[PDB]
Amino acid sequence: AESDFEQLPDDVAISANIADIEEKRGFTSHFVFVIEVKTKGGSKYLIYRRYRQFHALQSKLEERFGCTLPTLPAKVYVGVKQEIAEMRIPALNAYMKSLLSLPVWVLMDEDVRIFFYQSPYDSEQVPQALRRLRPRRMAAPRAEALFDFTGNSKLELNFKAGDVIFLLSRINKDWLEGTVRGATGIFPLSFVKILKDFPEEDDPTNWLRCYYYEDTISTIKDIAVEEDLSSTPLLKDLLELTRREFQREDIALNYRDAEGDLVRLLSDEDVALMVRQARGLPSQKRLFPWKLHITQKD
């Protein structure tokens, strides 16, 4: 114990008690646990973990070490989403206390270390919380044409006054990049009335881009996902999400392989490969690197 401890660095967690529960409108609108971690060093911070993440850790922990590993209770929680959460609290703290009580060599497991490390995203979330819990989904940006406009180049957009243009990106002061019914191009900002602006620069809300393939055209539709940008979802997550968005069910989620081939997303291991593949791709600021290509299903 004496030596056992001292050899462990100060950023090592010694206590992780839940401080709050928050509802995150992620791929699936679920709940997350606002855990407060205190380290040997004496610094206390907040991290956000969903249930699925604890479980995912246990499974990883058990695989490796094949002392006594603590396990998460068996499921019977069934009430509202919130309730099923507030209920898991006591169980959860228990898990952490135990887990952090384990021996040095298991406490220094990257996979465990990381679970407790505060992440860029975890930190973006605290300021966000204060701003609401004591103030002073989200539609993608769009505007309305105020006058007909004919593009001056192949690059400039074309539209009729009154059209609804969805903003894809800001270019400079006088121009924007938007899309209007399969058409994508840049346009003079003077020709529209902003209907819903771009998210403010410091908003930690991410977005998932979808290319919706219809019968005649093929549109682009961004969706506000409050999830870490590097997370991986479950094919069932994307399926539930993409439906409440496009208001239908016979759609196939596809993505474009690195080489260019289209790929059907049938299995979770498929999604995980998609995400794993995009991980390197040139980053857009708050846009998941992997983009879906929804198509009609026959």
Curated annotation (Swiss-Prot):
SUPFAM superfamilies cross-referenced by the UniProt entry: CAD & PB1 domains, PX domain, SH3-domain
Domain text: The PB1 domain mediates the association with NCF2/p67-PHOX.
Chain's gene name: NCF4
Quaternary structure (record): Component of the phagocyte NADPH oxidase complex composed of an obligatory core heterodimer formed by the membrane proteins CYBA and CYBB and the cytosolic regulatory subunits NCF1/p47-phox, NCF2/p67-phox, NCF4/p40-phox and the small GTPase RAC1 or RAC2. Part of a cytosolic complex composed at least by NCF1, NCF2 and NCF4. Interacts with NCF2 and NCF1. The NCF2-NCF4 complex interacts with GBP7 (via GB1/RHD3-type G domain).
Database matches in Pfam families: PB1 (PF00564), PX (PF00787), SH3_1 (PF00018)
Protein name: Neutrophil cytosol factor 4
Domain PB1: 205-297
GO MF term list: phosphatidylinositol-3-phosphate binding; superoxide-generating NADPH oxidase activator activity
Organism: Homo sapiens
PROSITE patterns recorded: PB1 (PS51745), PX (PS50195), SH3 (PS50002)
Keywords: Chronic granulomatous disease, Cytoplasm, Disease variant, Endosome, Lipid-binding, Membrane, Phosphoprotein, SH3 domain
Residues reported to bind a 1,2-diacyl-sn-glycero-3-phospho-(1D-myo-inositol-3-phosphate): R50, Y51, R52, K75, V76, Y77
Superkingdom in the source lineage: Eukaryota
